[PDB]
Amino acid sequence: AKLETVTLGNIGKDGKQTLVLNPRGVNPTNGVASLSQAGAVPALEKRVTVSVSQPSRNRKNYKVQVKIQNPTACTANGSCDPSVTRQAYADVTFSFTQYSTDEERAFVRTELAALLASPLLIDAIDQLNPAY
Amino acid sequence: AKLETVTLGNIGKDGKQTLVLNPRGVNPTNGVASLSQAGAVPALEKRVTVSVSQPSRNRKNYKVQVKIQNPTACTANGSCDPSVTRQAYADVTFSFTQYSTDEERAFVRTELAALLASPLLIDAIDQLNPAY
Amino acid sequence: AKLETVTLGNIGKDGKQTLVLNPRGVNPTNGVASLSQAGAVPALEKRVTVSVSQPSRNRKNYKVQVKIQNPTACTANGSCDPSVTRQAYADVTFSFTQYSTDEERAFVRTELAALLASPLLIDAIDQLNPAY
Amino acid sequence: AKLETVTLGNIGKDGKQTLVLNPRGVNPTNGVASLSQAGAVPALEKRVTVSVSQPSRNRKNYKVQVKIQNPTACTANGSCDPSVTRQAYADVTFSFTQYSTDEERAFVRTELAALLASPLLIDAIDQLNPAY
Amino acid sequence: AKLETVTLGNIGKDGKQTLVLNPRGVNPTNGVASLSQAGAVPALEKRVTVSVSQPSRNRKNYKVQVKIQNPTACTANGSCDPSVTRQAYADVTFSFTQYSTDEERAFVRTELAALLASPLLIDAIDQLNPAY
Amino acid sequence: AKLETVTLGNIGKDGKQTLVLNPRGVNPTNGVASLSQAGAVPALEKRVTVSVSQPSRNRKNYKVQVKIQNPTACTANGSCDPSVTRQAYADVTFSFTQYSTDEERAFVRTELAALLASPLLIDAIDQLNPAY
Numbered sequence: 001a002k003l004e005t006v007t008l009g010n011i012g013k014d015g016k017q018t019l020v021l022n023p024r025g026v027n028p029t030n031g032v033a034s035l036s037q038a039g040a041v042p043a044l045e046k047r048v049t050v051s052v053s054q055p056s057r058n059r060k061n062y063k064v065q066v067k068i069q070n071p072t073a074c075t076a077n078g079s080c081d082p083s084v085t086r087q088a089y090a091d092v093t094f095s096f097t098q099y100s101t102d103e104e105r106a107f108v109r110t111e112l113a114a115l116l117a118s119p120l121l122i123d124a125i126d127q128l129n130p131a132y
Numbered sequence: 133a134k135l136e137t138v139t140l141g142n143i144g145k146d147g148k149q150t151l152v153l154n155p156r157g158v159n160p161t162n163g164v165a166s167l168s169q170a171g172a173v174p175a176l177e178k179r180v181t182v183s184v185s186q187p188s189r190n191r192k193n194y195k196v197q198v199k200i201q202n203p204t205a206c207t208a209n210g211s212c213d214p215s216v217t218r219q220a221y222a223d224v225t226f227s228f229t230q231y232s233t234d235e236e237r238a239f240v241r242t243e244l245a246a247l248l249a250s251p252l253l254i255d256a257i258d259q260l261n262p263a264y
Numbered sequence: 265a266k267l268e269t270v271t272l273g274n275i276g277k278d279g280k281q282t283l284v285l286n287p288r289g290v291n292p293t294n295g296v297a298s299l300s301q302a303g304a305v306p307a308l309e310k311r312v313t314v315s316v317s318q319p320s321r322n323r324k325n326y327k328v329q330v331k332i333q334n335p336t337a338c339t340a341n342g343s344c345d346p347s348v349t350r351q352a353y354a355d356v357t358f359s360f361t362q363y364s365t366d367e368e369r370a371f372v373r374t375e376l377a378a379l380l381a382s383p384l385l386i387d388a389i390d391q392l393n394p395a396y
Numbered sequence: 397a398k399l400e401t402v403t404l405g406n407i408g409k410d411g412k413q414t415l416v417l418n419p420r421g422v423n424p425t426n427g428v429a430s431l432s433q434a435g436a437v438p439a440l441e442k443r444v445t446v447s448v449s450q451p452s453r454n455r456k457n458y459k460v461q462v463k464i465q466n467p468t469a470c471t472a473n474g475s476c477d478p479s480v481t482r483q484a485y486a487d488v489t490f491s492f493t494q495y496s497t498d499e500e501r502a503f504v505r506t507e508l509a510a511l512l513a514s515p516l517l518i519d520a521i522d523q524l525n526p527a528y
Numbered sequence: 529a530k531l532e533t534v535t536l537g538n539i540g541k542d543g544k545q546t547l548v549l550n551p552r553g554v555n556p557t558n559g560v561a562s563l564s565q566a567g568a569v570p571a572l573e574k575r576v577t578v579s580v581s582q583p584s585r586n587r588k589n590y591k592v593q594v595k596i597q598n599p600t601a602c603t604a605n606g607s608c609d610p611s612v613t614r615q616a617y618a619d620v621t622f623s624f625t626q627y628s629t630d631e632e633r634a635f636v637r638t639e640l641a642a643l644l645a646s647p648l649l650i651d652a653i654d655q656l657n658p659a660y
Numbered sequence: 661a662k663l664e665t666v667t668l669g670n671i672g673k674d675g676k677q678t679l680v681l682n683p684r685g686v687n688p689t690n691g692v693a694s695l696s697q698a699g700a701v702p703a704l705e706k707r708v709t710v711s712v713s714q715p716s717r718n719r720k721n722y723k724v725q726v727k728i729q730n731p732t733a734c735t736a737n738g739s740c741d742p743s744v745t746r747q748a749y750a751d752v753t754f755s756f757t758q759y760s761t762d763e764e765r766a767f768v769r770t771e772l773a774a775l776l777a778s779p780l781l782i783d784a785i786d787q788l789n790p791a792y
């Protein structure tokens with residue numbers, strides 16, 4: 001990565017749609033890669049922001065982070081320009097020790113993806129169901 | 133949503149192992165369940181903690197958080213007690229408003245699992261190679 | 265050079281529209297051509313300007329500058345007049361040394377037109393879209 | 397955007413030559429596209445680069461900046477080695493609002509290509525004729 | 529000249545060792561490419577960094593610079609965590625004239641590799657002193 | 661590490677070139693050994709020089725300075741005093757601790773020569789740096 005385009009498929013409530021984010025680029029103060037929705041509305045686009053520490057000494061207990069932004073907008077009466085009335089977010093971090101291996105980093109990655117995909121969280125999030 | 137066990141299949145570097153979590157120690161203060169490997173001490177070491185959000189009050193929105201902790205164990209000779217260091221962690225959160233819908237929630241979480249499975253994050257996590 | 269109505273055919277993302285900017289004149293304040301389309305208010309909005317800077321005592325080489333003004337307008341309320349909320353524009357400079365010739369002057373114009381036609385700028389402008 | 401070799405054909409005084417600008421890696425410290433006549437000595441090299449940026453601190457619009465350079469050298473100017481004697485450049489900046497469509501952004505891009513081909517600029521640029 | 533996996537071989541004291549370097553991408557902090565071995569395993573740092581410099585307005589220095597970091601660790605008896613006691617380094621810089629060509633630049637690089645492998649430089653640091 | 665004439669071959673971008681440098685003795689004030697060209701004018705000679713030591717009170721550790729100087733000149737802007745013209749230059753610094761082993765030093769020398777011989781750097785010093 002090296003990614004010219006990022007496509008997430010099998011998404012949405014029924015697991016049937018796709019989202020294409022194109023890289024905008026990498027931010028040269030932050031060292032942060034940034035993707036956003038391929039649709040032509042810069043004002044109102046889905047975004048993914050990605051960072052990994054060098055690691056530097058104070059970032060040796062390194063972070064890998066992805067920020068997810070999904071605004072929802074509509075057009076107000078009397079305004080040709082649409083705007084966001086609600087926003088949805090997610091924020092995921094790893095890892096953090098310098099002595100972790102790719103295998104452990106992956107377990108955390110997948111013990112996560114496999115949980116996000118599990119009914120516990122599907123209903124705890126989609127219907128705001130307390131666990132009991 | 134329910135304090136049922138979770139089978140996290142298809143996990144690890146190649147997506148081929150399984151870990152099973154069993155919820156316990158739910159703290160009524162905040163409705164947060166500790167999901168962990170069932171049995172002995174590893175049950176205390178390898179765990180995922182899951183909160184469930186509820187709308188409004190603080191404020192006109194809500195937040196969901198899951199904490200992942202996977203410690204590395206070893207022990208001194210003659211010790212009565214093993215210990216863990218070089219611990220792997222992750223944190224995933226979600227944020228939505230009080231008027232949010234199920235469809236926008238589904239995209240934020242369904243993307244996220246698809247996003248974790250994307251080379252974007254596989255490289256950012258497994259190698260620590262950000263998409264540069 | 266001498267002004268005449270400039271008709272720009274085959275324009276817009278689909279290459280189907282035509283813009284017609286009449287040779288209103290040249291502003292003697294600064295030697296700037298004024299080309300516009302057509303109405304009492306719209307001609308003050310849809311505009312192209314042109315000027316030439318000759319080599320000079322300020323130890324300057326020569327250049328040609330072209331400005332593109334493409335504002336649009338939206339809604340109106342009880343105050344009744346419409347207004348511009350958005351504007352697309354460009355500032356186009358052609359820079360040459362004092363001994364530069366016609367061939368070089370022509371290459372810069374045509375290379376740019378070829379580049380504007382090329383996918384690199386189709387995507388830089390229609391999409392996000394910085395390199396990568 | 398994505399880089400690939402661009403062949404800027406139908407260029408120059410008679411509209412008959414081609415520049416073949418091969419992709420160069422994109423340096424993240426600015427995210428600038430770089431295509432060039434790579435067989436050239438770097439002090440000569442004919443090159444096209446594109447800089448694209450999003451709104452940020454002190455910046456409200458989206459911008460695309462295009463730089464075209466064509467230095468020309470004398471192969472052996474009383475020497476054995478080439479030395480640049482002539483230079484010619486394009487420096488074009490485009491600017492768009494965040495809420496904007498591709499159709500609209502494209503008009504400024506396409507209008508310029510159509511404009512570059514106009515008799516007004518053929519004379520304003522190739523003969524360096526002032527407006528009149 | 530591009531991000532790629534680099535495999536070395538026929539290296540080491542007996543000339544029989546191999547090494548594979550997995551890229552980290554290009555770091556926006558300074559626009560510099562880097563690659564490391566596993567790269568997840570060498571928690572104690574095994575790295576190669578490659579510049580990527582530009583013929584800047586204030587320098588015209590588009591040099592190639594490669595930095596090599598090779599630590600050696602000691603295990604503190606019954607330790608769960610090994611640590612570096614020695615660090616070896618190498619730093620190679622290639623300085624160029626702006627009118628230089630590929631064969632000129634290659635003469636120096638190929639000359640250097642041929643020299644590093646020569647008995648004179650091998651003896652000076654394998655066992656001895658400044659040459660005599 | 662006695663200086664003796666060093667003959668290099670299989671050098672240049674195509675690996676088709678030789679170079680012979682003869683000992684000129686050693687600079688006694690800094691231990692900088694030198695291999696000279698067989699010509700009459702030092703200004704235009706290709707040469708290689710070397711010195712290795714651990715300073716008594718700038719220590720740190722042991723470092724070696726390996727330097728390549730390749731001046732170029734031509735008689736057209738000559739023939740008298742055909743000055744430089746395409747100067748090429750490179751060097752290597754290596755450093756080791758007092759405990760570095762014999763194989764450690766060998767490893768680093770060979771790792772570097774193997775990298776210099778790698779396609780990554782073969783192309784980096786030529787027409788394109790690994791900006792991406």
